[PDB]
Amino acid sequence: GIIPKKRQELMKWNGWGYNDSKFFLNKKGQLELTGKRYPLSGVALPTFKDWIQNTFGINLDHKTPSIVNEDFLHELKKTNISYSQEADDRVFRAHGHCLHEIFLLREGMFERIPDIVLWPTCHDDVVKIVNLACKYNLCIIPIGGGTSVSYGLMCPADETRTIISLDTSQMNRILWVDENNLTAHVEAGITGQELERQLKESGYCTGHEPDSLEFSTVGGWISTRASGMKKNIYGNIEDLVVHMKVVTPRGVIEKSCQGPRMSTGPDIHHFIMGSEGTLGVITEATIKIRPTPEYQKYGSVAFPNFEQGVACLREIAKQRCAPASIRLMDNQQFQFGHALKPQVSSIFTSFLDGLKKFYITKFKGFDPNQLSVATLLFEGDREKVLQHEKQVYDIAAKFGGLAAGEDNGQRGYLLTYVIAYMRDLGLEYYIIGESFETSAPWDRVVDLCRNVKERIRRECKEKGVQFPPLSTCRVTQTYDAGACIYFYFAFNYRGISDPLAVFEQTEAAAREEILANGGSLSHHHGVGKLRKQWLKESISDVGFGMLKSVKDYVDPTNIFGNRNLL
Amino acid sequence: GIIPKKRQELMKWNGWGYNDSKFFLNKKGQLELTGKRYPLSGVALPTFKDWIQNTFGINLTPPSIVNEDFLHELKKTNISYSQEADDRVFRAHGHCLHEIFLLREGMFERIPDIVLWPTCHDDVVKIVNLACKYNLCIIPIGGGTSVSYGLMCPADETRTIISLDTSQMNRILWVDENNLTAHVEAGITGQELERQLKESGYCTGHEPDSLEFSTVGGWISTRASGMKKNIYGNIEDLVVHMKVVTPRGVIEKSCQGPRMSTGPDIHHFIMGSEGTLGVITEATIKIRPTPEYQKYGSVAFPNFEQGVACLREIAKQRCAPASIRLMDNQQFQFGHALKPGFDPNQLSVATLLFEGDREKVLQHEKQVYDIAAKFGGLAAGEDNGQRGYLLTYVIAYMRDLGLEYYIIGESFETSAPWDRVVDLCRNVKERIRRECKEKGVQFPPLSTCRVTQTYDAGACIYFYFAFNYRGISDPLAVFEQTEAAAREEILANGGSLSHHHGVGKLRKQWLKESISDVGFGMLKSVKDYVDPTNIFGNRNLL
Ligand SMILES: Cc1cc2nc3c(=O)[nH]c(=O)nc-3n(C[C@H](O)[C@H](O)[C@H](O)COP(=O)(O)OP(=O)(O)OC[C@H]3O[C@@H](n4cnc5c(N)ncnc54)[C@H](O)[C@@H]3O)c2cc1C
Ligand SMILES: Cc1cc2nc3c(=O)[nH]c(=O)nc-3n(C[C@H](O)[C@H](O)[C@H](O)COP(=O)(O)OP(=O)(O)OC[C@H]3O[C@@H](n4cnc5c(N)ncnc54)[C@H](O)[C@@H]3O)c2cc1C
Ligand SMILES: C[C@@H](CC(=O)NCc1ccc2[nH]c(=O)[nH]c2c1)c1ccccc1F
Ligand SMILES: C[C@@H](CC(=O)NCc1ccc2[nH]c(=O)[nH]c2c1)c1ccccc1F
């Protein structure tokens, strides 16, 4: 679970995830995932090829130096801090996981990359590096897991200083577990996977489960205001983090006491949370923990349509009895999920006809090209969980909801960690895309989803895309005041002059549409360098200027020079 | 429900609360509260005189300095204002003991020069532009309930001080039943906000003990906590949007998404800012349907320690009801005295308030008493539960009672991790006794605590300290000293500087240790950007 220093040894140098895990055609011409990492790994998906071909109209056969100061260098040796000027170590840490970046990793090259990589192993190391960076006028860009989807890691082209990629992966210990107060103090480089694993050996968990938890780190979560799948029980990162230590050019930031709630002026933890590497390195953090849940239970519910589903989720929110996780997928995602089942279709009956017949006895009177499905996960004490399950199934019944089986439920949940591997699959077959998200008030969700989807159609048609894009959404989180809506956008770029440009423009147009329908700039992805142009409008000129005042104070010479946010 | 401009029409000029409400000796020589405003108004308290006796051993104006070019321009706005002494003196203080003395017995070194009463966001915008133009100081005031010297005019401040009174800026602007939010002007009081919302079937459930007078804007500025925070949250959970007038301009996010990732959260730059940055003029607050049913409860424990463990367990299982409070023996005996085997001197008591749907309430109630039985806890009745919660809003009236019989005191609070709670309570208590004997207090002071909020990582501990000062040379200086010492003992035993009261000017000397030098400095950089000429010059925090 520890990220090794030469990452490409275990991880794909040119896309998401582990080397051992990729989609391939098996000996029977069926898509399948290699390796044994996931429960879907090594499982034939016989209907997946057909769903891809139907959805995108492709056949699926035809395919696609280090400038550094010597005095600094000499001083860095005294430290014993491990470092590297190797091109592959630098290029690996020159990007996150936005589409354009993955393309420059593949057929091309980055304009700017880190000049050198350092691997601090403790808070004190980080202090020395930041001291050295003051002394030699270095730029620093921290990296944890490298999972940013906001251009949060890209080196600005015109940065002339020596860029240090300050890799926190080796700074990864649980320093203490306080069982009395239910907190764990950890180093910021620990990955979510490794954090839960170790805590579990003591009987504990954080329950903070973002989809990137295999590689995303405690310090990255804090930096980007990360959200996890089980936020309803455990909180998002701002509810979970109770203390932190941050190294800035101006000094260390750390509160004295760990009183559970304070009134001592504006809460400085929130100046840092969401700071996106522009202020310093978060080195250690104290995070709330919980007894590992005794029992988990999956479920799923089908509704006549998306609108009915949304209203049910709204009512669940209203009664404040959301489960650990509830997600409502639109019809396309329901069909996609059907397209991963193991039943082998006759080549003479369409996708849609097997679907209709499959759900004819099961979902009566439901239109199969209109229906939507909520997946559900419950956890806690068995007796509590089962009580709560009945409560939730009884509310959903009032919106036309029909219980669709724990199997759909469990399936949706496992699939979450494998979806990110589909980009690479898509890329080999001229299919590009990206996920994006917003949060919106309850009263805007249905119109927002509908208009955002239709904006994507219109803009793809107008730019020359030959087939109507995949354009699907789901509701991933509920709150009192609204919801997180999460979208996928994908298309075949065959015929297109400049496919990245077209993706670019269409993703911007979507964001315009989102905001115009009362949605937020971001729910959890952050701003990075992707959404800077809307920031001022979203937080106000004065709010923007207050962010700048904190930045100019703690980092006056702009050492933490990723240029995210401002 | 609206506070009148001449507040002394309705509220005591020299102390807490309403003119119609004061404790007195009734026709049978029993203490009782005047008026009909509270459920204990007009209810005789036969045993409270005995308690006071056993416990304390007693038997029972400067001119308005203001520029005329400013004043000439104020008249064009039609914003209501006063330079009258009694309007300025009412707004020169909140509710710390030394303030209550200068108010009664003498005078404040400095008071506001003019009181303005804006009615809306645009009025406030004009006030702030006028203050930029004529170089004035603004100290916002809402309910005047600060117990941190957050309202005190600094003595050496020689600019005209405007008391910017928000009480006429007090309507609900809209209630969004789809999103369950309520967008309000920031001067609305808690009582008036809950009254209006209840006509629609809704509540915020935010219930500070000061709710009759304290305001949405005050709450946000002080990071206020309320009695049913377990269900509804504290103010930082409740607020979804705000509009703020600073000298640099208006702070306002441009969308009501429930949760964002758009950098460091700017609401938290203003929440807790204590009137040092601008005026909070409007706020959106989460609302909920009014709960259907409420029930009180109480549990007796063999000692305080068992009590604390039980509440730790209840927190651990995340099954706290609306309110749960644990009282030490001395507060348990105080309650017993105020009605209309197990060791007597050690036995402690938790009061409970459950609310929501009737059948859910009863299941919850069973779960809680079950958890409690494991720590020796015995159900001790609902009447008990109720009396404690009724008392909540009368205790503030006991100050002015006490001051008639040479008894002075104050309450104070901290938050602390679970495993510091028991020792912090014992040590803080003992530290007060020690300080009181060393300073010449005839009788051992009243020194009680209770645990008032529980959380994942710990609890809120609320203390009362009171003593008879008959015979003491400088009894305010002794109290001041003994308060300061109990805060040192709090900080030394793992406690925070403040759970909810805040910092103002009373706890300023400890802030830098608490938040670190770089933290402090971050706050100063925000202040200097937003308010470069320090128009918001109350000098709280920094
Ligand atoms: C497949 C996939 C799934 C995802 N799922 C989710 C999800 O469910 N929820 C969610 O919120 N996000 C998700 N993300 C986005 C991303 O994982 C988060 O933003 C995450 O919090 C970043 O973690 P990281 O450790 O990879 O940070 P990195 O990507 O390494 O860095 C992100 C930012 O923080 C800075 N930074 C990193 N570490 C530190 C530190 N210690 N101190 C200061 N600054 C630092 C960097 O400079 C950069 O600006 C996902 C991304 C991918 C690619
Ligand atoms: C009897 C009693 C009981 C109390 N109970 C509680 C309790 O249960 N929980 C709790 O948290 N606190 C409590 N307090 C403390 C106090 O009531 C709170 O801090 C409250 O939030 C202050 O509200 P207010 O409207 O009275 O503010 P004020 O006392 O008017 O002002 C407090 C500070 O806020 C500033 N301010 C006021 N309004 C604005 C505005 N619109 N914009 C900018 N700044 C502004 C002022 O300058 C001052 O610095 C209590 C106080 C008393 C006397
Ligand atoms: C899964 C997405 C590509 C993508 O957006 N990857 C990054 C990613 C994956 C899963 C996530 N879950 C998130 O909350 N943010 C995420 C970000 C995708 C893959 C192939 C085609 C289209 C497409 F949108
Ligand atoms: C009740 C207090 C006086 C006091 O502290 N009033 C202010 C106050 C009242 C109730 C509160 N509830 C709070 O949470 N903070 C509070 C602050 C008191 C009165 C007489 C003698 C002693 C004494 F401590």
UniProtKB/Swiss-Prot annotation, chain A:
Effect the entry attributes to changing residue 327 to K: Strongly reduced activity
Subcellular location as annotated: Peroxisome membrane; Peroxisome
Impact when changing residue 484 to A: No effect on activity
Catalytic site positions: 486 (proton donor/acceptor)
Pathway: Glycerolipid metabolism; ether lipid biosynthesis
GO cellular component entries: peroxisomal membrane; peroxisome
Consequence of substituting residue 486 to F: Loss of activity
Listed cofactors: FAD
Reactions that this protein is recorded to catalyse: a long chain fatty alcohol + a 1-acylglycerone 3-phosphate = a 1-O-alkylglycerone 3-phosphate + a long-chain fatty acid + H(+); hexadecan-1-ol + 1-hexadecanoylglycerone 3-phosphate = 1-O-hexadecylglycerone 3-phosphate + hexadecanoate + H(+); 1-hexadecanoylglycerone 3-phosphate + a long-chain fatty acid = a 1-acylglycerone 3-phosphate + hexadecanoate
Regulation: Inhibited by N-ethylmaleimide, p-bromophenacylbromide, 2,4- dinitrofluorobenzene and divalent cations such as such as Mn(2+), Mg(2+) and Zn(2+). Inhibition by p-bromophenacylbromide is strongly pH dependent and is highest at alkaline conditions.
UniProt site (Important for enzyme activity): 327
Consequence when changing residue 217 to I: Impaired FAD binding and protein stability. Loss of activity
pH dependence, record text: Optimum pH is 7-8.
Bilayer-crossing regions: none
List of residues binding FAD: 142-148, 211-217, 224-227, 276-282
SUPFAM superfamilies reported in the protein's UniProt record: FAD-binding/transporter-associated domain-like (SSF56176), FAD-linked oxidases, C-terminal domain (SSF55103)
GO molecular function: alkylglycerone-phosphate synthase activity; FAD binding
PROSITE patterns: FAD_PCMH
This protein's UniProt keywords: Acetylation, FAD, Flavoprotein, Lipid biosynthesis, Lipid metabolism, Membrane, Peroxisome, Phosphoprotein, Transferase, Transit peptide
EC numbers, comma separated: 2.5.1.26
Keyword 4Fe-4S found: no
GO biological process, one term: ether lipid biosynthetic process
Oligomer and partners: Homodimer.
Family: Belongs to the FAD-binding oxidoreductase/transferase type 4 family.
PANTHER family referenced in this protein's UniProt entry, alphabetically: ALKYLDIHYDROXYACETONEPHOSPHATE SYNTHASE, PEROXISOMAL (PTHR46568:SF1)
Protein name per its UniProtKB record: Alkyldihydroxyacetonephosphate synthase, peroxisomal
Species of provenance: Cavia porcellus
